Design a binder for this molecule. Structure first.
Ligand SMILES: CSC[C@H](NC(=O)COc1cccc2cnccc12)C(=O)N[C@@H](Cc1ccccc1)[C@H](O)C(=O)N1CSC[C@H]1C(=O)NC(C)(C)C
Lengths: 99, 99
């Protein structure tokens, strides 16, 4: 698809068998999702944004479907205001910005 | 241009006579620039993201040249660590996300 930006670029993701909504976010290096249970061991990470730094849980090699495209990679879990698909997974689906 | 997302999508912008580097950010509703002086009347606003909220000054009808393309819109000024070009100005330069 070709997504214009007059509205937020919200898509449906499937993770852990659940459907969720998430934003395609070119300003985010990483992918961060709201609190949920994921399989496996996690590692600690600090990420920062507009209002400061938050601690999150890093899970690796997680299967996630983004608007119907399968991606496998790192997902962070923490207290984020919105589910964010960042550039680590946007590169896996082949997304580009065009103007 | 077509901009791949292996790296942060940073471009040069010109605002208020000054050249600055800024991030093209499809996750941002608003455009937020580091503290600088701009002409005109402003109103205070709070904006939130990862980490919480910050206070900014809202300037209306500002002209910004984004990688050589002129756009006009609302610009928020305040203590951001990175200059952010959000959807309110990305629309005006005809930016789309494609996959
Ligand atoms: C994975 S979530 C963390 C993400 N941060 C980043 O990828 C990179 O951060 C940084 C890069 C370089 C220097 C930095 C210094 N101090 C803090 C963060 C920094 C982030 O919050 N990115 C956001 C943009 C941004 C990048 C760098 C600094 C600050 C903000 C995001 O694209 C967005 O637009 N979001 C995510 S939450 C809502 C919305 C957002 O903040 N909206 C505004 C800007 C408040 C309107």
């Amino acid at each position: 698809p070709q997504i214009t930006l007059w509205k937020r670029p919200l898509v449906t993701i499937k993770i852990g068998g659940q459907l969720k909504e998430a934003l395609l976010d070119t300003g985010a290096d990483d992918t961060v999702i709201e609190e949920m249970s994921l399989p496996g061991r996690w590692k600690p990470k600090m990420i920062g944004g507009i209002g400061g730094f938050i601690k999150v849980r890093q899970y690796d090699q997680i299967i996630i479907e983004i608007a119907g495209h399968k991606a496998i990679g790192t997902v962070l879990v923490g207290p984020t205001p919105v589910n964010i698909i960042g550039r680590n997974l946007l590169t896996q689906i082949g997304a580009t910005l065009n103007f």
